[PDB]
Symmetry: C2
Subunit: 364 residues, 2 copies
């Protein structure tokens, strides 16, 4: 059992951070998770009994106090596990100076479409020189790393894991929740991505206007990084279409399995390739049908017409056609959903994922 210093730049619970909860939990007796900012993610790590600490930039390491503090701390640990891009910069420096092995867990697709050239060069060059191992969350992320110049031999793909038991909800609780939302007689499409242009909420909204009138959508998530312009653009879009009473924003929520159960279809509409797609697996584990954008790691998670649907990124009419399909062919749709549950339960079970992480770390 090695002492591990996990690093993550964000104090907010984005996908990489929620993923980090499961990655770190088995190591929590001897681990520390270091954050470069405070927020609800700190709270979450406490609730799960994972030791955590916020490093700050308050005061040769006079240029970057945070980096110095992390370097100091890293001396007390056997391994540095960088979970985000800024965390890789800091972890790489600490890996050199404290002479500690570095793992980089890659949750992004390092492509020009997602990031500036400088960010790509930095991540790729730091990973190549300092990382003993690059764990990619999907073959698509592995691929994009390599196309950006990253070293193939450093890469292993390990999917996000999920605690299977969290994804059941009673018929009775479903009914109540649908009641409380005021959607009991709607066909409900749930979108569970943080609000940001590339997560494509506006595509779902465009599709709604081509759907039957009983279809409403719940947008779950907040603008995690100050994309408040986008949120305003959504509200205006909703208004310009006839959609004011057909779209509810619920903000960031914690009861995701329950809200997914309350939906009739879960939709993922990213307009740029999704590296993995947690909401996709989560939908499947809740036994709900899911439609996703046909790119990135979604293609690995979904076989169209078998365990979900895939539509061309950016194309709202296709999304509408799939919604209509789910309304009309309910028995097909229920079998698809049910197949999804069975498959995803095997593939993405946190127990198997944890075993893979353990084996990979032991094999260094």
């Amino acid at each position: 059992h090695m002492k591990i210093l996990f690093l993550d730049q964000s104090g907010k619970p984005g996908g990489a951070e929620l993923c980090l909860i499961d990655i770190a939990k088995p190591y929590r007796d001897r681990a520390l998770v270091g954050l470069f900012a405070d927020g609800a993610f700190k709270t979450l790590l406490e609730q799960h009994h994972i030791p955590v600490e916020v490093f700050t930039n308050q005061p040769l390491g006079q240029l970057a106090p945070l980096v110095a503090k992390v370097v100091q701390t890293a001396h007390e640990y056997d391994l540095i596990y960088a979970n985000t891009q800024k965390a890789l910069v800091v972890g790489a420096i600490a890996s050199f100076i404290a002479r500690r092995p570095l793992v980089y867990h890659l949750h992004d697709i390092l492509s020009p479409e997602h990031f500036s050239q400088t960010n790509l060069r930095v991540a790729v060059n730091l990973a190549n020189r300092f990382a003993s191992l690059v764990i990619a969350n999907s073959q698509a992320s592995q691929t994009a790393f390599i196309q950006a110049g990253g070293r193939a031999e450093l890469t292993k793909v390990i999917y996000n894991g999920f605690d299977i038991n969290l994804y059941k909800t009673s018929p009775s609780d479903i009914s109540k929740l649908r009641q409380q939302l005021g959607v009991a007689n709607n066909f409900v499409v749930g979108h569970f991505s943080r609000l940001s242009p590339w997560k494509g909420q506006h595509i779902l909204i465009d599709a709604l206007a081509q759907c039957p009138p009983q279809v409403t959508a719940i947008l779950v998530g907040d603008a995690l990084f100050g994309e408040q312009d986008y949120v305003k653009e959504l509200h205006q879009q909703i208004t310009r279409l006839g959609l004011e009473n057909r779209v509810k924003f619920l903000g960031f929520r914690a009861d995701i399995p329950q809200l997914m159960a309350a939906c009739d279809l879960v939709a993922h509409t990213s307009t740029a390739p999704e590296p993995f797609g947690r909401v996709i697996v989560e939908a499947m584990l809740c036994g709900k049908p899911v439609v996703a954008a046909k790119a990135g790691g979604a293609m690995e998670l979904v076989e169209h017409g078998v365990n979900g649907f895939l539509t061309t990124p950016g194309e709202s009419q296709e999304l509408a056609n799939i919604i209509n399909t789910c309304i009309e062919d309910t028995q097909k749709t229920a079998t698809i959903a049910s197949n999804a549950q069975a498959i995803a339960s095997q593939r993405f079970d946190v127990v198997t994922i944890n075993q893979q992480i353990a084996e990979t770390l032991s094999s260094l």
Copy 2:
């Protein structure tokens, strides 16, 4: 010529900074000197008409180190980044990579365990090795220490500090005035012109004075530039412990160094850790004064003992005393030595030759 972005971590006018004025001055039409702090060095650069900018660490990846992001930003406008100090090499390395600009490292330090922490040595060596197209060392002793620490020999070229030969002339009347104003006209005056740090060894000179006759006095010229206020106290206490209140004077940081050197009878360099080059030494020589220096580092390239100056064992006050007494007694030899020193130094460290060596080195990248 090429647009050069010079970088130097300090706003204080230390050796490396004084040397940088001369290095940068010919390129001033297209160059910029970036300081990572404000101070008297900014004023000096302004006075020599060399564009200067103070980068501060107030505000993507740039959030961790804004100063770095500003420098990286600035580097796109230049053809070459010229790092003059260690922290400037960290930042210049980063900027060399991101902005895609070649980097030169001008090495004014002896990178050895005695002078620096292990981390500093590793950082400096690895960055130079990976990012610098050239390491200009100030002395063979600096080149050597670099190589011994892991630095790549083939990156190194030695180029000494240069000096404006004309600045070292002082009237015998201005000299008499000055000795008078200091209250030292009847003394044998030993001047020390190093900044106040323990390794510059002012305390050795003070111990030496206790083994000298009472008409021997010292002027300590310089300041604690890097927080060595405890050393300043220690010196004063030392002075009080021995009987020396009347025989040692501190003048703080002075600009009139040629004149002050003229007003001494002997210039003393007494560093207790190896000196990388030693500007004061050459400066003394250019003033036609005799100089005793500590036998280590670049001082040994500068001084042949008995010929153009004297050398003594680092940390040994009795040896330094013996040389002071000898300079009192053997005035004719001493003046010959001092005079020889000026002829040599004036050929060997003329800023004109040195600017030329630097221009060819840069030119051939």
